[PDB]
Amino acid sequence: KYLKSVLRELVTYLLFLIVLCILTYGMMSSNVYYYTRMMSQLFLDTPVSKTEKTNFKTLSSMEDFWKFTEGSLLDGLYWKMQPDNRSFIFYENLLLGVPRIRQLRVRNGSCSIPQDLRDEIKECYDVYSVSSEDRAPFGPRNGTAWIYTSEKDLNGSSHWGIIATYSGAGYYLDLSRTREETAAQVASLKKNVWLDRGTRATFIDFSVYNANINLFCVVRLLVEFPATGGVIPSWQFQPLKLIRYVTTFDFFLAACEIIFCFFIFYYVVEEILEIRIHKLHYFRSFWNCLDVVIVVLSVVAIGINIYRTSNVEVLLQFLEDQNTFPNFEHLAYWQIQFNNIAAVTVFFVWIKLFKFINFNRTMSQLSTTMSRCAKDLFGFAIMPFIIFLAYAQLAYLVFGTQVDDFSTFQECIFTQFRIILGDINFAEIEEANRVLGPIYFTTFVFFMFFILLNMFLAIINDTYSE
Amino acid sequence: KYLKSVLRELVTYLLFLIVLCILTYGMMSSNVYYYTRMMSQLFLDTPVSKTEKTNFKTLSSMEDFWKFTEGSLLDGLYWKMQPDNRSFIFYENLLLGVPRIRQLRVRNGSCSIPQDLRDEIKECYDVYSVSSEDRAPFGPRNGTAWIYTSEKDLNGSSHWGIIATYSGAGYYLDLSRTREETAAQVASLKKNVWLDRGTRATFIDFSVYNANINLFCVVRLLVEFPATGGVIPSWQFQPLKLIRYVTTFDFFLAACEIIFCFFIFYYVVEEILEIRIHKLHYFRSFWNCLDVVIVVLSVVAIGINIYRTSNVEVLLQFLEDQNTFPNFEHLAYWQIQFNNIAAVTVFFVWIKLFKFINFNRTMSQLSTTMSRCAKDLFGFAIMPFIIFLAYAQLAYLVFGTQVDDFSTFQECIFTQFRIILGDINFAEIEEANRVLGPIYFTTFVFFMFFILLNMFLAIINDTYSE
Amino acid sequence: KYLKSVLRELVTYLLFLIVLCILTYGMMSSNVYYYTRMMSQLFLDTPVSKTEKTNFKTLSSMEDFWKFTEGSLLDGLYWKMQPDNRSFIFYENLLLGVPRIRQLRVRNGSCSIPQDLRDEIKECYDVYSVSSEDRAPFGPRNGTAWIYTSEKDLNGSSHWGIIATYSGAGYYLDLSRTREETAAQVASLKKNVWLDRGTRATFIDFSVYNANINLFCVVRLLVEFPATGGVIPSWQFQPLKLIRYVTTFDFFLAACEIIFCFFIFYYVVEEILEIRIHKLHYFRSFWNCLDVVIVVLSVVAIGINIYRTSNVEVLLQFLEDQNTFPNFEHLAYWQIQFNNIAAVTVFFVWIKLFKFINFNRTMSQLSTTMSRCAKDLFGFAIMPFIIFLAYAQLAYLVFGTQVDDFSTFQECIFTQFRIILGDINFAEIEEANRVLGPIYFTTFVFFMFFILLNMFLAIINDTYSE
Amino acid sequence: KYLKSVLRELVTYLLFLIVLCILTYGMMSSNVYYYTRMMSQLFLDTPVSKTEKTNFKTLSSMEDFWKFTEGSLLDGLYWKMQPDNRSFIFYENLLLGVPRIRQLRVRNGSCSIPQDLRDEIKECYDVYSVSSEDRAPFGPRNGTAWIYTSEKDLNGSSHWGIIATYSGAGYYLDLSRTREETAAQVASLKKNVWLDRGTRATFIDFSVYNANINLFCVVRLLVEFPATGGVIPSWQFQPLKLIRYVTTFDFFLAACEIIFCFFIFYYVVEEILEIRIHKLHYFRSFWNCLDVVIVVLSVVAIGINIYRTSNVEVLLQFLEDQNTFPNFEHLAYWQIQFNNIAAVTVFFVWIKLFKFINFNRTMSQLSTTMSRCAKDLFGFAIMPFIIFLAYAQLAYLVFGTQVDDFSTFQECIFTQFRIILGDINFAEIEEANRVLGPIYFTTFVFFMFFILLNMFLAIINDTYSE
Numbered sequence A, B, C, D: 001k002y003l004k005s006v007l008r009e010l011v012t013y014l015l016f017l018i019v020l021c022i023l024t025y026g027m028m029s030s031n032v033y034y035y036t037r038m039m040s041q042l043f044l045d046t047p048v049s050k051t052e053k054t055n056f057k058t059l060s061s062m063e064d065f066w067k068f069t070e071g072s073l074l075d076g077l078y079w080k081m082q083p084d085n086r087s088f089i090f091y092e093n094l095l096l097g098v099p100r101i102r103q104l105r106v107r108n109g110s111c112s113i114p115q116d117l118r119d120e121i122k123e124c125y126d127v128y129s130v131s132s133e134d135r136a137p138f139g140p141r142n143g144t145a146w147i148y149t150s151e152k153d154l155n156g157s158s159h160w161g162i163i164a165t166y167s168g169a170g171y172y173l174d175l176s177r178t179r180e181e182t183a184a185q186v187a188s189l190k191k192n193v194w195l196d197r198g199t200r201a202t203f204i205d206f207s208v209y210n211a212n213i214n215l216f217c218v219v220r221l222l223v224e225f226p227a228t229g230g231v232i233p234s235w236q237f238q239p240l241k242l243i244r245y246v247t248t249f250d251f252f253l254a255a256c257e258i259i260f261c262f263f264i265f266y267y268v269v270e271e272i273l274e275i276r277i278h279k280l281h282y283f284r285s286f287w288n289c290l291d292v293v294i295v296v297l298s299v300v301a302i303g304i305n306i307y308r309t310s311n312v313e314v315l316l317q318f319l320e321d322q323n324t325f326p327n328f329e330h331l332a333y334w335q336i337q338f339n340n341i342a343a344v345t346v347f348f349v350w351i352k353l354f355k356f357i358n359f360n361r362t363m364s365q366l367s368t369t370m371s372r373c374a375k376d377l378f379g380f381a382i383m384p385f386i387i388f389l390a391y392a393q394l395a396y397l398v399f400g401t402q403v404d405d406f407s408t409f410q411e412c413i414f415t416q417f418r419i420i421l422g423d424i425n426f427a428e429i430e431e432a433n434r435v436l437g438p439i440y441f442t443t444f445v446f447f448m449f450f451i452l453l454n455m456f457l458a459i460i461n462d463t464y465s466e
């Protein structure tokens, strides 16, 4: 044995945990936040013009977008020279290739205009959708900025924005490597009207490479044009690490990764043979059910890691010709996915530690606390739950067309959580509705704590009657 | 049965609930918040002049109001042309008809000036009231902007503003359909003094119609002139949906509405026959008392819905002549009322779910809680209540002339709730009173939790003695 | 009883309560906050110059003060004419008399300069105090702005500012009734240096009278010059109500006041004979000890009210000659004192309500809670208390020279209360000290709830053992 | 013993406590915060130029730093003359000596550039470290601003900045005593490029002395240049008190300090003979173990105090020649250390008071409370603890490259504490990650209170079963 088996399990789990911790510490670099901070400050906070005070974070119309495209964007992208034409941003960022600008359009007459308003209005444009997307040339064709390009010819993917989800095809244009030619191209796009009443989205893409610390950065600025009017901006900066095996620490990380997958295989093989006739009722105790989540997450993480390391050479064929657009979107997407999976896996492995500390005299504490008390809350706690969702629905129906925090129903849930915690924005609620606002606020705050106190009392009495 | 009856009740209630939920989902459109957001940003955030930094949200005097009326208001209302005169705001809004501006005045000498100050002051003007309202012509009569018009001749109703409630009559002027004529009219109003020391309110009204998503928007901006001086601005951006039966989904929603009123009739008829000699003591158990609130709310909602659908054609006679002012205030008012009633009804229907989940083994949980614990708080909880209102009155008497959060006594209640939750603005309280401010704050925060803890202890002891 | 006596006490107490409520409602006017709001916005928020963006609320040096005195102050005080020289601020405020500006100085050589730094520095000026105050003429005497005037000759009293308390005497100058003469006087003061290295405070006083609602307003702007450098501003706006008996409601309130003092006499006489040989042990039960506080507060409030109504005519002799400075500071001070006393009295009267609701079957509710539970917290609660003051002292010693929230030791108490509630400003603490800041924050937040919960458990266990 | 011994201990402890309180009150001056506040307002809030709106607190590039160095820095440091060349800042500060500017550089080619990117990039510079530091002359040597100076020759020590810890040596330049010469020197530094792609830090140092209250102020301005790009400003204002024994109160404080060291010696001598064969088990009861912490802290504080008073004359040899740079960094460092030690010592002495109030009938209060309740929380509380650190690690892995609250892992702990208290910044978390952000927030807030409540219940049940 009893003692030897549990000690062996404890020591092997400790080795697995320390290996995983070394992996996470090694892969997670330090002082990376300031790189993205400087990029975002340069591209989103500088005013679009010297006389104006408008920036990218607060855009209002197509005129502002045009002022930004030929203004603050060109100033912060093409740096003159340090003491060749390679545009070292901040003097060591080395803008890679050329940027690209792409738009998405919809079809005219994709609506059902009421017959009453048939003499005053003769054009309509639906909200963005795959069925309403436009695929015809417009304006002076004369190139690729006025001709639809399919999602397969244009090596892209689907980007999920604030309003809707966008396909990834459309009308694109590759800008130039210098300031003058790019400015001329943008002026030509502005002259021959490019954004006119049919545009529903616009993307700007480029990448930089910092030599002092090996990291790439992909910038994807998105401006959405709703069917009502105005614009909605989004930036989404993201760093990358493509080149590996540069220092001895990288080979040490490779070694710890391979022994880590060895531990994963050892756990899965030692856990799959004991789901056999013996211990066949294996789906209980909440500890044996977690060891399958651990191995599933580890297997998918290993699959992503070995699928993401086989493309660092195929997609860096850009080193041969540094004149075209380097497409690095998929690499950033898989970085994000792998980081999320690794964080979830390490969180679960860390919280699995309770199963070993319970075998000491803690059983009378842990046991009782997690059995007689962590089980009867989950019985009668739906009363807090049903009234929470009822209040969320009431807030979404009353507010949500006037208050930004109450649109998009899930944000009602998040706003209610913040209100319970103490993050209150009562001015906007008061301004929106002067009667139901205060009533909703006071009734919610009163009844949540009322019912919580009630349930607490109930459980105390149940314990006293037990 | 016993089982069959409760199962029948459960299934019919579930059908009613799903019908109500689908109705609410269908009627509540998506991404409506951005329409009002763009309107409000255009009209309330742009500076009144290029050199100035003052906007509508922060107005200070009549000079600022005059600068706004011929400045940012005209710029954001008349758009030049897209590539006729119809003024497509943001290129997709189509300002309907012409805007209207109206004011309310009071009579000179409606005061009782003290005999001591009788040689230095010879004019006085009371605060706004129906008895003090002015009804005489002034200045160069020459039209309708200088002649009183009754609330019956001028189609309108009262509006409940920040300081007082305004009748809805007064001196109005219909602006023009173009920028030049409207600017000339506003300049003529400014020259021959039209706002002079007697004005107590000013309204601006107009409407727009977005064709991409069929929705109207009624805008009314109210500027109040208190007897003390200065101005107070307000806004009531509210969307509308007048044209229906445009998509098959609308007819599906109509079918849902008719089956919903069928369920309402079925519930009321099955509930009114059983309030008879059998179960005559029907005003208890808190569940039978809720089913009458449900039917009352449903009946009033149905009445409002069928009264609001018979005027979508009578009041849209504006389509014949698009040169006058389209009056849509009542439609917006009834939209607001119907939305509030529907939200309350669905909230109550959702919280009615507890009576069916209780018939399973949950009765021993819900029982004690709402029979021994949710009742004895309501007995001894007035001590938290009396001292809460005493503190509110103390804060209203001490503060409230220096702090905006403590004027208008109900705001003392709301501020106390926010202080308990954790939203504190202690700087202004410290600045207002340097002695009673901190004393009140610390004593309130101490004593609230003191008495709460005390009551908790009391109830625990009562449970232990029972 | 027994019944008749308690019913008589209840009915007379409710009569007293309703009389007090009508008195307070009548004396407290409505919509007074906007008057002071407009005054403060006009005088504290407008930039000192058109090119500059500095206002009174954020002043930095003597140059800024000089720019404000001849800039935004003169613009917002002398209004040109409405369509005589009387300067109706906002067109109905009627600046009364002329404003006055006064300064306080200290003596040169009131220090003890170290002998080491005796060759580089030859002047010193102590912080403000009565012993260090200067009383000699300076500059070109030529009038009263360069000659000391005693606190008795100059009708005034002390004002308790931010840094210290100021005597109320000094060098004063009465400005003019028009813009040109006042500007010339301020320019002459600026030319012949009047604020020079010895000034420790500066006051600006004036008053206005609104005719639409009978109210005065006294403004006392204070700018402090610390011995280190810079300035600290303060404004302290305060309304007044001098003229009474103007409407019938005023006479109704007078009748309410006289019947109120009748009730006060009745209570004091009925309470004073029963502290006799019978019920001689009258200093217990917490209810008989409160009825003496009630009568003391009522007597002092009546004394203040009858002392403040006999000077509304003596000090309004300014109506005879409207060319000099109207001194209204004492009236505002007594308004503040009377309002504070009345608010405290009504709060105590409201919380006295518990003794009558207790004689019903509520008596068993409050025995344990006010006899067994409200007493044993006050026994073992000094551990929350001693560690609270120890933490306050630690925060005052560590911070307080870098953070504004931790200077002036009582503000450490207030900041700790706000931190417990949830109002955190962690950025400043992090910037101040990188080690003791976070340690103090986390340790305080952990240990406060640790000890509180522990005490709760102790109270429970004791109740279970009792 | 019994009574006499405990009374003697109580009275001697009271004497010690009052002596310590008098010492702390005497040493801690009043209204010191405003001195540093005015300095920081003058040097960090003024815009770098009249046309620009950028200040020191928000710097972005080397151009901004150059504009600040010859702009707002020179304006706020050299004041023209009061009605000699001594530059009385704010007219009472007397800038001491001359300021000094110093930089730190790294070596070119201190990287390992990948062989793939070997044709486009030919320079690299590692992050700051002692191994990568540059020690060679550059540019036109011609003086000491272009030649490395060791830490022993350049009197100084290391400083702990935001990104890393800097050595304290480098290339320095002593500015002039007047505005013109200093401006010329800064222009010459700007012309011959002095900050160029290798600079990793820059320091600015000076000091002032206020004669009205004898206090020095050392200002150190640090600007960090990360390898990624941009700048990170950092400041430090610290008052000093070098000259003592100026008033009689100083000699009284000296007497208090000496009698305090007599009390410390008496406590240590009476405590070291009691750890003898009698009561040799001295390391229990939590009271006997704290009296050694008290004496250790007191001894180290006395050592620092007597080591810091022997250099107030050695290092003030600058009085002989007021033309060079006065180095006062070590004095400020020891002020900070002594203040921290004294605050900790007085906090511990204050919280030690519980041992004397316990000998009255309070012993039963803290029996269960401090032996049965404060002990079993520390047993089963690691579940709140392990899941707290697991959540911190998850937040650091997911966020921390996009949100500044989650970089630098300890800030994850602090942000979690603030979130629990109620200080939420949910907009940034929502913008960074749209799926794991809300999930993490809601799950953390739910599970923390879930497990806390569970443990509370466990404790209650254990108490009831014991």
Ligand SMILES: *[C@@H]1O[C@H](CO)[C@@H](O)[C@H](O)[C@H]1NC(C)=O
Pocket (backbone or CB within 6 Å): A108, A109, A122, A123, A124
């Ligand atoms: C859009 O389509 C309608 C369909 O009849 C047509 O009348 C209108 O001219 C079209 N508008 C444009 C801009 O092509």
Ligand SMILES: *[C@@H]1O[C@H](CO)[C@@H](O)[C@H](O)[C@H]1NC(C)=O
Pocket (backbone or CB within 6 Å): A140, A141, A142, A143, A188, A192
């Ligand atoms: C194509 O021709 C149009 C006019 O015919 C012109 O506006 C446009 O700039 C041209 N594009 C290119 C790429 O030459």
Ligand SMILES: *[C@@H]1O[C@H](CO)[C@@H](O)[C@H](O)[C@H]1NC(C)=O
Pocket (backbone or CB within 6 Å): B140, B141, B142, B143, B188, B192
């Ligand atoms: C009416 O006449 C007055 C002057 O007599 C003039 O100011 C005003 O503009 C005129 N109004 C119209 C509508 O002509």
Ligand SMILES: *[C@@H]1O[C@H](CO)[C@@H](O)[C@H](O)[C@H]1NC(C)=O
Pocket (backbone or CB within 6 Å): C140, C141, C142, C143, C188, C192
């Ligand atoms: C007094 O005389 C001085 C110069 O002698 C002058 O500056 C000042 O303005 C005069 N004051 C008055 C009130 O005339």
Ligand SMILES: *[C@@H]1O[C@H](CO)[C@@H](O)[C@H](O)[C@H]1NC(C)=O
Pocket (backbone or CB within 6 Å): D108, D109, D122, D123, D124
């Ligand atoms: C940095 O060192 C590399 C090493 O070869 C050299 O090629 C390059 O010119 C150097 N750069 C500078 C600025 O000295």
Ligand SMILES: *[C@@H]1O[C@H](CO)[C@@H](O)[C@H](O)[C@H]1NC(C)=O
Pocket (backbone or CB within 6 Å): D140, D141, D142, D143, D188, D192
């Ligand atoms: C040293 O000489 C260089 C040019 O040779 C010049 O730029 C620099 O200013 C000189 N420095 C001094 C201190 O004279």
Ligand SMILES: [Ca+2]
Pocket (backbone or CB within 6 Å): A421, A422, B421, B422, C421, C422, D421, D422
């Ligand atoms: Ca809170």
